[PDB]
DNA sequence: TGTCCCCTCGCTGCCGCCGCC
RNA sequence: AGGCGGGCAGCGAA
């Protein structure tokens, strides 16, 4: 069973991977694989004078009694530690014990690292997360093809369960499927009564076939364009909106009465279409936040369509922790926020990172932004104002999608993910410490090293000879000073 | 669960405090 | 009104 994984989620001490699978007719559809039996990689560090056999004979009976396990896989293993903890020998033989994430009893208590005993005085790898454990032990390096054997038959077309993380092994295939991309554009208003922002119009620009192997053509037309419109002030739209929308507004325009029906129809379209990638401009910081809050307040039973996991209940703590909550709900669909830290990192020439400015910078095409304030009754009496605002929403969605493909946000993030070994969404979010952490994790784990469990003077600047220098002057720089320094003097943790 | 993007240096504007010519 | 000393915040750069 071959699957190209995209994102992950954790629940009930199990890890679930979201990806695409070729059918018999090699058609690519969404898939979900729930993987059981994932287990923690423990290391017991013996005290001076004791051996892993003593740690075995002492602790494994206690561990089997404690976790209610029939048997526990464990073996002495020589391992190297070269990190910041003191009293840890440079090389010692450890008792490499294997503890499943899901145990019959007391499944969510982690063995303390500082745990002392007569045989050992330290434990390593006791609080590692499920995704870390799988991505390290099975040597997964970013999104890549995945061979699954003994598959046992969410908002994914295929649902798969496997009880052994081993059968799941990465392939050598560098070719990767076509992506279902759905760009988003959102228009909001604050209501003075409750002082909350409310969704007015949502634009859905679908790009069903995007292949990151070959280059993306410029200004590709979306395979489908649909819009969802809500009465901003009154409950009745100005007469003639539908006919004018069909005569002028591009794509389909479907019209509503209230916010609840609009969000329900949005959820239905999201579930039916099943994007792989969600484009947008300031989506994660603003638009996804307001979308989720409006979804929760209006009590839509299908809020889980924004991701690929099927949730009947909203997490109870929802109501500055909303970032993680949104990231967890939207698990399955990548958020390609063109204005986030990664997006800003790929366009340092912009000053405000507004949609118009970034369009002008990346695509060299000028668009004049229009200020839409639906609080003005111009959009409840006039129909031309409503259709102009809808046209602006369509234009914003198209611009966001096009500039997203212009900078290869997805392609760069995928390449750096396969370089780092983290997940695609995490590096899409703009992190830099996560990629470094995971590349070091993979490199040190593959070389028999014990990975650690989860203010100084800088460079020297000279005083300039301030003034004008009419003679020819040269610039003499060091190509990547710090990396070539670390290679030069062989600076390392080890 | 709850995270992050090295500190540190030098540069400019603003604000409040102190002494002075 | 002006120069200096310590403090905060904002930001461009290595």
Short mmCIF file of C-alpha atoms (C1' of nucleotides) in Angstrom, two decimals:
data_model
loop_
_atom_site.label_atom_id
_atom_site.label_comp_id
_atom_site.label_asym_id
_atom_site.label_seq_id
_atom_site.Cartn_x
_atom_site.Cartn_y
_atom_site.Cartn_z
CA UNK A 1 0.00 0.00 0.00
CA UNK A 2 1.74 3.14 -1.29
CA UNK A 3 0.83 6.52 0.22
CA UNK A 4 2.35 10.00 -0.09
CA UNK A 5 1.91 11.46 3.39
CA UNK A 6 1.29 15.18 3.95
CA UNK A 7 0.40 15.88 7.60
CA UNK A 8 -0.11 14.17 10.95
CA UNK A 9 -2.14 14.28 14.16
CA UNK A 10 -2.03 12.62 17.58
CA UNK A 11 -4.98 11.20 19.51
CA UNK A 12 -5.52 8.35 21.99
CA UNK A 13 -1.77 7.56 21.97
CA UNK A 14 -1.99 6.81 18.23
CA UNK A 15 -0.45 8.59 15.26
CA UNK A 16 -2.46 9.23 12.09
CA UNK A 17 -0.92 10.22 8.75
CA UNK A 18 -2.82 12.07 6.02
CA UNK A 19 -1.81 11.55 2.42
CA UNK A 20 -2.74 10.62 -1.13
CA UNK A 21 -2.87 7.14 -2.67
CA UNK A 22 -3.05 6.03 -6.29
CA UNK A 23 -6.02 3.75 -6.90
CA UNK A 24 -5.98 0.82 -9.34
CA UNK A 25 -6.52 3.36 -12.14
CA UNK A 26 -3.63 5.35 -10.45
CA UNK A 27 -6.18 8.01 -9.51
CA UNK A 28 -4.99 10.00 -6.51
CA UNK A 29 -7.46 10.29 -3.63
CA UNK A 30 -7.12 11.34 -0.01
CA UNK A 31 -6.22 8.71 2.58
CA UNK A 32 -5.96 8.27 6.34
CA UNK A 33 -3.68 5.74 8.05
CA UNK A 34 -4.13 5.12 11.80
CA UNK A 35 -0.99 3.47 13.13
CA UNK A 36 -0.99 1.45 16.35
CA UNK A 37 1.77 -0.09 18.41
CA UNK A 38 4.12 2.88 18.23
CA UNK A 39 6.48 2.66 21.17
CA UNK A 40 8.95 4.81 23.07
CA UNK A 41 12.73 4.38 22.79
CA UNK A 42 13.98 4.25 26.37
CA UNK A 43 17.59 4.28 27.58
CA UNK A 44 18.50 3.46 31.18
CA UNK A 45 21.94 4.77 32.13
CA UNK A 46 23.54 2.42 34.69
CA UNK A 47 25.44 3.63 37.71
CA UNK A 48 29.17 2.93 37.89
CA UNK A 49 29.70 -0.79 38.46
CA UNK A 50 26.33 -2.01 37.15
CA UNK A 51 25.30 -3.55 33.83
CA UNK A 52 22.15 -3.47 31.67
CA UNK A 53 21.33 -6.99 32.86
CA UNK A 54 20.96 -5.65 36.41
CA UNK A 55 18.69 -2.85 35.18
CA UNK A 56 16.71 -5.52 33.33
CA UNK A 57 16.29 -7.84 36.32
CA UNK A 58 15.38 -4.87 38.52
CA UNK A 59 13.08 -2.73 36.38
CA UNK A 60 11.32 -4.85 33.72
CA UNK A 61 9.22 -6.72 36.32
CA UNK A 62 8.25 -3.33 37.76
CA UNK A 63 7.47 -1.95 34.29
CA UNK A 64 5.35 -4.97 33.32
CA UNK A 65 3.42 -4.74 36.59
CA UNK A 66 3.09 -0.97 36.18
CA UNK A 67 1.88 -0.83 32.56
CA UNK A 68 0.02 -4.16 32.58
CA UNK A 69 2.09 -5.56 29.72
CA UNK A 70 2.59 -9.25 28.97
CA UNK A 71 6.14 -8.68 27.70
CA UNK A 72 8.49 -5.77 27.02
CA UNK A 73 11.20 -5.75 24.35
CA UNK A 74 14.54 -4.64 25.79
CA UNK A 75 18.22 -5.14 25.00
CA UNK A 76 21.55 -3.73 26.16
CA UNK A 77 22.83 -1.15 23.70
CA UNK A 78 26.00 0.92 23.52
CA UNK A 79 25.09 4.57 23.01
CA UNK A 80 26.97 7.88 22.93
CA UNK A 81 26.03 11.08 24.76
CA UNK A 82 27.74 14.36 23.87
CA UNK A 83 25.34 17.00 25.18
CA UNK A 84 24.82 19.50 27.98
CA UNK A 85 23.88 17.10 30.79
CA UNK A 86 26.68 16.51 33.32
CA UNK A 87 27.43 13.23 35.11
CA UNK A 88 26.59 11.44 31.83
CA UNK A 89 29.59 9.43 30.54
CA UNK A 90 30.79 10.04 27.00
CA UNK A 91 30.03 6.43 26.04
CA UNK A 92 28.21 3.83 28.13
CA UNK A 93 26.15 0.71 27.55
CA UNK A 94 22.45 1.44 28.07
CA UNK A 95 19.43 -0.81 28.60
CA UNK A 96 17.42 -0.03 25.47
CA UNK A 97 13.83 -0.66 26.63
CA UNK A 98 10.79 -0.40 24.35
CA UNK A 99 7.60 1.05 25.86
CA UNK A 100 4.42 1.27 23.75
CA UNK A 101 2.56 4.57 23.60
CA UNK A 102 -0.74 2.73 24.18
CA UNK A 103 -0.54 0.49 27.24
CA UNK A 104 -3.47 -1.38 28.85
CA UNK A 105 -3.25 0.69 32.05
CA UNK A 106 -1.72 4.09 32.88
CA UNK A 107 -0.86 4.90 29.27
CA UNK A 108 -0.10 8.62 29.72
CA UNK A 109 2.50 8.75 32.49
CA UNK A 110 6.10 9.38 31.35
CA UNK A 111 9.09 7.75 33.16
CA UNK A 112 11.06 10.65 34.79
CA UNK A 113 14.59 11.23 33.38
CA UNK A 114 15.87 11.98 36.90
CA UNK A 115 14.55 8.62 38.12
CA UNK A 116 17.18 7.02 40.35
CA UNK A 117 17.65 3.44 41.51
CA UNK A 118 20.28 0.98 42.70
CA UNK A 119 21.15 -0.01 39.12
CA UNK A 120 20.54 3.14 37.06
CA UNK A 121 20.36 6.88 37.71
CA UNK A 122 18.96 8.35 34.47
CA UNK A 123 16.40 7.55 31.77
CA UNK A 124 16.44 8.93 28.22
CA UNK A 125 13.69 9.14 25.62
CA UNK A 126 10.75 8.95 28.03
CA UNK A 127 8.74 12.00 26.95
CA UNK A 128 9.30 11.82 23.18
CA UNK A 129 6.22 12.55 21.11
CA UNK A 130 4.60 9.98 18.83
CA UNK A 131 5.38 11.84 15.60
CA UNK A 132 9.02 12.26 16.64
CA UNK A 133 9.34 8.56 17.48
CA UNK A 134 7.86 7.40 14.19
CA UNK A 135 9.73 9.92 12.03
CA UNK A 136 13.03 8.93 13.68
CA UNK A 137 12.82 5.14 14.11
CA UNK A 138 11.40 4.53 10.62
CA UNK A 139 13.83 7.10 9.15
CA UNK A 140 11.16 9.30 7.57
CA UNK A 141 12.61 12.45 5.97
CA UNK A 142 9.83 14.89 5.12
CA UNK A 143 6.88 14.13 2.84
CA UNK A 144 7.77 11.12 0.70
CA UNK A 145 6.21 7.95 -0.65
CA UNK A 146 5.45 5.30 1.95
CA UNK A 147 5.14 1.52 1.60
CA UNK A 148 2.54 -0.05 3.90
CA UNK A 149 2.04 -3.81 4.25
CA UNK A 150 -0.76 -5.65 6.01
CA UNK A 151 -3.08 -2.66 5.75
CA UNK A 152 -6.43 -3.10 7.51
CA UNK A 153 -9.43 -1.53 5.78
CA UNK A 154 -12.24 11.17 8.87
CA UNK A 155 -12.78 13.22 5.71
CA UNK A 156 -10.42 11.06 3.62
CA UNK A 157 -11.46 8.66 0.88
CA UNK A 158 -9.37 5.76 2.24
CA UNK A 159 -9.12 4.84 5.93
CA UNK A 160 -6.33 2.43 6.86
CA UNK A 161 -5.13 0.95 10.16
CA UNK A 162 -1.83 -0.82 10.87
CA UNK A 163 -0.81 -2.23 14.26
CA UNK A 164 2.98 -2.30 13.63
CA UNK A 165 4.94 0.90 12.70
CA UNK A 166 7.56 -1.36 10.99
CA UNK A 167 5.54 -2.36 7.90
CA UNK A 168 5.44 1.37 7.12
CA UNK A 169 8.73 2.09 5.33
CA UNK A 170 9.74 4.96 3.02
CA UNK A 171 10.38 4.44 -0.67
CA UNK A 172 12.99 5.85 -3.06
CA UNK A 173 10.40 7.50 -5.33
CA UNK A 174 11.10 11.21 -5.78
CA UNK A 175 8.00 11.75 -7.94
CA UNK A 176 5.08 13.18 -5.97
CA UNK A 177 1.36 13.53 -6.69
CA UNK A 178 -0.69 16.46 -7.93
CA UNK A 179 -2.17 18.70 -5.25
CA UNK A 180 -5.75 19.88 -4.73
CA UNK A 181 -5.26 23.59 -3.97
CA UNK A 182 -8.13 25.84 -2.85
CA UNK A 183 -7.32 29.53 -2.40
CA UNK A 184 -9.29 31.51 0.17
CA UNK A 185 -10.36 35.15 0.39
CA UNK A 186 -12.34 36.49 3.34
CA UNK A 187 -14.23 39.73 4.01
CA UNK A 188 -15.19 40.58 7.59
CA UNK A 189 -17.16 43.12 9.61
CA UNK A 190 -17.21 43.95 13.30
CA UNK A 191 -20.69 44.12 14.79
CA UNK A 192 -20.91 46.92 17.41
CA UNK A 193 -23.36 44.93 19.55
CA UNK A 194 -21.02 42.05 20.42
CA UNK A 195 -17.74 43.63 19.17
CA UNK A 196 -16.81 40.54 17.16
CA UNK A 197 -15.87 40.20 13.50
CA UNK A 198 -18.33 38.39 11.24
CA UNK A 199 -17.77 36.72 7.87
CA UNK A 200 -19.52 38.39 4.93
CA UNK A 201 -18.19 36.76 1.76
CA UNK A 202 -15.98 33.72 1.13
CA UNK A 203 -14.21 33.01 -2.16
CA UNK A 204 -13.23 29.47 -3.16
CA UNK A 205 -10.72 29.26 -6.02
CA UNK A 206 -9.91 25.60 -6.67
CA UNK A 207 -6.72 24.47 -8.43
CA UNK A 208 -7.13 20.70 -8.60
CA UNK A 209 -3.93 19.72 -10.50
CA UNK A 210 -0.74 21.32 -9.19
CA UNK A 211 2.47 19.32 -9.63
CA UNK A 212 5.57 20.52 -7.78
CA UNK A 213 7.89 18.35 -9.90
CA UNK A 214 7.42 20.37 -13.08
CA UNK A 215 7.27 24.18 -12.84
CA UNK A 216 3.90 25.84 -12.24
CA UNK A 217 2.76 27.90 -15.26
CA UNK A 218 2.10 31.60 -14.77
CA UNK A 219 -1.44 32.90 -14.21
CA UNK A 220 -3.10 29.47 -14.34
CA UNK A 221 -6.89 29.63 -14.38
CA UNK A 222 -8.64 27.89 -11.46
CA UNK A 223 -10.50 24.70 -12.29
CA UNK A 224 -13.51 26.07 -10.36
CA UNK A 225 -14.55 29.42 -8.90
CA UNK A 226 -17.40 29.81 -6.40
CA UNK A 227 -18.42 32.54 -3.98
CA UNK A 228 -20.55 32.59 -0.81
CA UNK A 229 -22.33 35.84 0.03
CA UNK A 230 -24.15 36.97 3.18
CA UNK A 231 -26.48 39.94 3.76
CA UNK A 232 -24.18 42.42 5.52
CA UNK A 233 -26.68 44.73 7.22
CA UNK A 234 -30.26 43.76 6.32
CA UNK A 235 -31.65 40.26 5.69
CA UNK A 236 -32.70 40.98 2.08
CA UNK A 237 -30.28 41.73 -0.74
CA UNK A 238 -30.95 44.59 -3.16
CA UNK A 239 -33.05 43.44 -6.10
CA UNK A 240 -31.10 42.43 -9.18
CA UNK A 241 -28.02 41.11 -7.38
CA UNK A 242 -28.21 37.60 -8.85
CA UNK A 243 -28.66 38.69 -12.47
CA UNK A 244 -25.90 41.30 -12.23
CA UNK A 245 -23.63 38.74 -10.55
CA UNK A 246 -24.19 36.25 -13.38
CA UNK A 247 -23.68 38.96 -16.00
CA UNK A 248 -20.50 40.47 -14.48
CA UNK A 249 -18.96 38.45 -11.63
CA UNK A 250 -16.69 35.61 -12.81
CA UNK A 251 -17.47 32.04 -11.85
CA UNK A 252 -20.46 30.86 -9.87
CA UNK A 253 -22.08 33.14 -7.30
CA UNK A 254 -24.39 31.42 -4.81
CA UNK A 255 -26.45 33.60 -2.50
CA UNK A 256 -27.74 33.12 1.05
CA UNK A 257 -29.92 34.52 3.82
CA UNK A 258 -27.73 34.32 6.95
CA UNK A 259 -24.34 33.31 8.32
CA UNK A 260 -25.26 29.81 9.53
CA UNK A 261 -26.41 28.56 6.12
CA UNK A 262 -23.37 30.18 4.49
CA UNK A 263 -20.98 28.40 6.85
CA UNK A 264 -22.85 25.11 6.41
CA UNK A 265 -22.55 25.38 2.62
CA UNK A 266 -18.87 26.30 2.99
CA UNK A 267 -18.35 23.16 5.08
CA UNK A 268 -20.19 21.07 2.49
CA UNK A 269 -18.04 22.41 -0.35
CA UNK A 270 -14.87 21.90 1.69
CA UNK A 271 -15.83 18.30 2.50
CA UNK A 272 -16.81 17.47 -1.09
CA UNK A 273 -13.83 19.14 -2.77
CA UNK A 274 -11.22 17.95 -0.19
CA UNK A 275 -8.30 20.31 -0.87
CA UNK A 276 -4.81 19.08 -0.12
CA UNK A 277 -3.44 22.64 0.27
CA UNK A 278 -5.25 25.74 1.55
CA UNK A 279 -3.85 28.97 0.14
CA UNK A 280 -4.57 32.33 1.73
CA UNK A 281 -3.28 35.73 2.78
CA UNK A 282 -3.07 36.34 6.53
CA UNK A 283 -5.15 33.19 6.95
CA UNK A 284 -3.61 31.60 10.05
CA UNK A 285 -3.23 34.83 12.02
CA UNK A 286 -6.59 36.46 11.21
CA UNK A 287 -8.90 34.72 8.77
CA UNK A 288 -8.75 31.16 10.10
CA UNK A 289 -9.21 32.60 13.60
CA UNK A 290 -12.37 34.52 12.70
CA UNK A 291 -13.63 31.58 10.62
CA UNK A 292 -13.25 29.14 13.52
CA UNK A 293 -14.79 31.59 16.00
CA UNK A 294 -17.81 32.19 13.75
CA UNK A 295 -18.07 28.43 13.25
CA UNK A 296 -18.11 27.80 17.01
CA UNK A 297 -20.53 30.62 17.83
CA UNK A 298 -23.05 29.56 15.18
CA UNK A 299 -22.75 25.88 16.21
CA UNK A 300 -22.06 24.25 12.84
CA UNK A 301 -21.85 20.45 13.31
CA UNK A 302 -19.39 20.09 10.39
CA UNK A 303 -16.64 22.50 11.49
CA UNK A 304 -14.17 19.61 11.13
CA UNK A 305 -14.30 19.89 7.32
CA UNK A 306 -11.55 22.53 7.51
CA UNK A 307 -9.21 19.63 8.26
CA UNK A 308 -9.21 15.98 7.27
CA UNK A 309 -10.09 14.50 10.68
CA UNK A 310 -13.76 14.07 11.59
CA UNK A 311 -14.56 15.80 14.89
CA UNK A 312 -18.03 15.74 16.42
CA UNK A 313 -16.98 18.02 19.31
CA UNK A 314 -15.01 21.26 19.58
CA UNK A 315 -12.15 21.08 22.11
CA UNK A 316 -13.47 22.47 25.38
CA UNK A 317 -10.57 24.87 26.02
CA UNK A 318 -11.45 26.87 22.89
CA UNK A 319 -13.11 30.17 23.75
CA UNK A 320 -4.00 32.88 23.15
CA UNK A 321 -4.21 29.08 22.89
CA UNK A 322 -6.43 29.26 19.79
CA UNK A 323 -3.39 28.94 17.50
CA UNK A 324 -2.79 25.29 18.44
CA UNK A 325 -6.52 24.59 18.40
CA UNK A 326 -6.81 25.88 14.83
CA UNK A 327 -3.69 23.94 13.81
CA UNK A 328 -5.20 20.75 15.25
CA UNK A 329 -8.67 21.20 13.70
CA UNK A 330 -7.19 21.93 10.25
CA UNK A 331 -4.99 18.82 10.47
CA UNK A 332 -4.94 17.19 7.03
CA UNK A 333 -4.97 20.33 4.87
CA UNK A 334 -1.83 22.44 4.56
CA UNK A 335 -2.19 26.15 5.33
CA UNK A 336 -0.15 27.96 2.67
CA UNK A 337 -0.36 31.37 4.31
CA UNK A 338 1.41 33.75 1.92
CA UNK A 339 1.72 36.42 4.65
CA UNK A 340 3.08 34.25 7.49
CA UNK A 341 6.69 34.07 8.70
CA UNK A 342 7.76 31.79 5.84
CA UNK A 343 5.91 33.88 3.27
CA UNK A 344 7.46 37.07 4.62
CA UNK A 345 10.83 35.31 4.62
CA UNK A 346 10.56 34.61 0.89
CA UNK A 347 9.63 38.25 0.10
CA UNK A 348 11.91 40.54 2.14
CA UNK A 349 11.34 43.38 -0.35
CA UNK A 350 7.84 44.10 0.99
CA UNK A 351 7.30 46.68 3.73
CA UNK A 352 3.77 45.88 4.95
CA UNK A 353 3.11 42.52 3.21
CA UNK A 354 -0.34 43.65 2.11
CA UNK A 355 -1.95 41.78 -0.77
CA UNK A 356 -1.58 44.64 -3.26
CA UNK A 357 2.00 45.43 -2.27
CA UNK A 358 3.08 41.79 -2.42
CA UNK A 359 1.34 41.41 -5.78
CA UNK A 360 3.27 44.42 -7.09
CA UNK A 361 6.53 43.02 -5.70
CA UNK A 362 6.39 39.32 -6.60
CA UNK A 363 4.34 39.43 -9.83
CA UNK A 364 5.17 43.02 -10.93
CA UNK A 365 1.44 43.52 -11.63
CA UNK A 366 -0.32 46.55 -10.16
CA UNK A 367 -3.70 46.24 -8.45
CA UNK A 368 -5.51 49.13 -6.77
CA UNK A 369 -7.04 47.98 -3.46
CA UNK A 370 -10.63 48.88 -2.63
CA UNK A 371 -11.76 49.57 0.93
CA UNK A 372 -14.91 47.54 1.57
CA UNK A 373 -16.82 48.65 4.68
CA UNK A 374 -20.17 46.86 4.48
CA UNK A 375 -21.29 48.85 7.55
CA UNK A 376 -21.93 51.59 5.00
CA UNK A 377 -25.54 51.17 3.75
CA UNK A 378 -24.10 51.57 0.24
CA UNK A 379 -23.93 47.76 0.19
CA UNK A 380 -27.46 47.23 1.54
CA UNK A 381 -29.21 49.64 -0.85
CA UNK A 382 -26.99 49.64 -3.96
CA UNK A 383 -26.38 46.49 -5.97
CA UNK A 384 -23.41 47.89 -7.92
CA UNK A 385 -21.51 48.37 -4.66
CA UNK A 386 -22.19 44.75 -3.68
CA UNK A 387 -21.04 43.40 -7.04
CA UNK A 388 -17.94 45.63 -6.97
CA UNK A 389 -17.03 44.32 -3.51
CA UNK A 390 -17.60 40.75 -4.70
CA UNK A 391 -15.37 41.41 -7.72
CA UNK A 392 -12.70 42.73 -5.35
CA UNK A 393 -12.99 39.56 -3.27
CA UNK A 394 -12.53 37.41 -6.39
CA UNK A 395 -9.53 39.52 -7.41
CA UNK A 396 -7.97 39.19 -3.95
CA UNK A 397 -8.36 35.41 -4.00
CA UNK A 398 -6.84 35.15 -7.48
CA UNK A 399 -3.95 37.44 -6.53
CA UNK A 400 -3.21 35.45 -3.37
CA UNK A 401 -3.17 32.15 -5.26
CA UNK A 402 -1.04 33.49 -8.12
CA UNK A 403 1.59 35.11 -5.88
CA UNK A 404 1.62 31.92 -3.80
CA UNK A 405 2.62 29.94 -6.88
CA UNK A 406 4.98 32.76 -7.93
CA UNK A 407 7.38 32.34 -4.99
CA UNK A 408 7.08 28.51 -4.85
CA UNK A 409 6.10 28.63 -1.19
CA UNK A 410 4.93 25.01 -1.39
CA UNK A 411 7.96 23.83 -3.37
CA UNK A 412 10.51 25.58 -1.14
CA UNK A 413 8.78 24.33 2.01
CA UNK A 414 8.68 20.77 0.65
CA UNK A 415 12.37 20.85 -0.27
CA UNK A 416 13.37 22.24 3.12
CA UNK A 417 11.10 19.67 4.80
CA UNK A 418 12.77 16.76 3.03
CA UNK A 419 16.07 18.40 3.95
CA UNK A 420 15.05 18.75 7.61
CA UNK A 421 12.81 15.75 8.28
CA UNK A 422 10.05 17.70 10.03
CA UNK A 423 6.45 17.97 8.81
CA UNK A 424 5.50 20.11 5.82
CA UNK A 425 2.98 22.27 7.68
CA UNK A 426 5.36 23.10 10.53
CA UNK A 427 7.99 24.58 8.21
CA UNK A 428 5.22 26.15 6.15
CA UNK A 429 4.32 28.06 9.32
CA UNK A 430 7.70 29.78 9.25
CA UNK A 431 9.66 28.06 12.02
CA UNK A 432 13.44 27.76 11.83
CA UNK A 433 14.24 26.07 15.14
CA UNK A 434 11.99 23.10 14.34
CA UNK A 435 13.76 22.24 11.09
CA UNK A 436 17.19 22.49 12.72
CA UNK A 437 15.98 20.46 15.70
CA UNK A 438 14.67 17.67 13.49
CA UNK A 439 17.65 17.55 11.10
CA UNK A 440 19.96 17.27 14.12
CA UNK A 441 17.57 14.68 15.58
CA UNK A 442 17.78 12.49 12.47
CA UNK A 443 21.54 12.91 12.05
CA UNK A 444 22.37 12.14 15.68
CA UNK A 445 19.89 9.25 15.96
CA UNK A 446 21.23 7.61 12.79
CA UNK A 447 24.75 7.69 14.28
CA UNK A 448 24.11 5.99 17.62
CA UNK A 449 23.74 9.12 19.77
CA UNK A 450 21.47 9.77 22.75
CA UNK A 451 19.29 12.74 21.77
CA UNK A 452 18.33 15.10 24.62
CA UNK A 453 14.72 15.11 25.73
CA UNK A 454 12.43 18.08 25.16
CA UNK A 455 23.60 36.28 26.63
CA UNK A 456 26.89 36.28 24.73
CA UNK A 457 28.81 38.70 22.55
CA UNK A 458 28.17 38.59 18.81
CA UNK A 459 30.03 39.64 15.69
CA UNK A 460 32.60 42.42 15.57
CA UNK A 461 31.77 45.63 13.70
CA UNK A 462 34.41 48.25 12.93
CA UNK A 463 34.00 51.99 13.34
CA UNK A 464 33.67 53.33 9.78
CA UNK A 465 35.78 56.05 8.20
CA UNK A 466 32.60 58.09 7.97
CA UNK A 467 32.48 60.27 4.87
CA UNK A 468 32.84 60.10 1.11
CA UNK A 469 35.60 58.04 -0.53
CA UNK A 470 36.13 59.09 -4.14
CA UNK A 471 38.71 56.41 -4.96
CA UNK A 472 37.75 52.88 -5.95
CA UNK A 473 37.00 50.70 -2.92
CA UNK A 474 36.43 46.95 -2.76
CA UNK A 475 34.12 44.75 -0.68
CA UNK A 476 35.83 41.63 0.63
CA UNK A 477 33.38 39.24 2.31
CA UNK A 478 33.47 35.70 3.69
CA UNK A 479 31.22 33.21 1.91
CA UNK A 480 28.98 31.88 4.71
CA UNK A 481 31.32 32.77 7.54
CA UNK A 482 29.63 30.83 10.34
CA UNK A 483 28.98 27.51 8.51
CA UNK A 484 32.46 27.48 6.98
CA UNK A 485 33.85 28.32 10.42
CA UNK A 486 32.09 25.34 11.98
CA UNK A 487 33.44 23.12 9.19
CA UNK A 488 36.88 24.75 9.51
CA UNK A 489 37.59 24.32 13.23
CA UNK A 490 35.26 21.30 13.55
CA UNK A 491 32.99 22.80 16.20
CA UNK A 492 30.45 20.24 17.36
CA UNK A 493 28.57 18.95 20.37
CA UNK A 494 30.83 15.88 20.21
"C1'" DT B 1 0.42 20.90 25.35
"C1'" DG B 2 1.23 24.88 24.03
"C1'" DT B 3 5.74 27.97 20.23
"C1'" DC B 4 8.61 30.39 18.72
"C1'" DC B 5 13.20 33.91 15.17
"C1'" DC B 6 21.58 34.07 18.02
"C1'" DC B 7 22.53 37.33 21.56
"C1'" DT B 8 25.19 41.33 21.34
"C1'" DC B 9 26.92 45.80 19.21
"C1'" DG B 10 26.49 50.36 16.82
"C1'" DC B 11 22.24 54.29 14.27
"C1'" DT B 12 17.59 57.62 14.47
"C1'" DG B 13 13.18 59.65 16.28
"C1'" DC B 14 9.72 60.04 20.90
"C1'" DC B 15 8.69 59.99 26.19
"C1'" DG B 16 9.67 60.75 31.59
"C1'" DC B 17 14.17 61.95 35.41
"C1'" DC B 18 18.81 64.65 37.00
"C1'" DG B 19 22.63 68.44 36.90
"C1'" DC B 20 24.48 72.70 33.96
"C1'" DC B 21 25.32 77.26 30.57
"C1'" A C 1 15.38 76.82 24.67
"C1'" G C 2 20.15 73.80 24.29
"C1'" G C 3 24.39 69.83 25.24
"C1'" C C 4 25.31 65.44 28.63
"C1'" G C 5 24.11 61.08 31.93
"C1'" G C 6 20.87 56.58 33.18
"C1'" G C 7 15.55 54.07 31.71
"C1'" C C 8 11.40 52.32 28.32
"C1'" A C 9 9.22 51.41 23.61
"C1'" G C 10 9.54 51.16 17.87
"C1'" C C 11 12.34 50.24 13.65
"C1'" G C 12 16.39 49.48 9.32
"C1'" A C 13 21.54 46.06 9.59
"C1'" A C 14 25.66 42.12 10.75
#
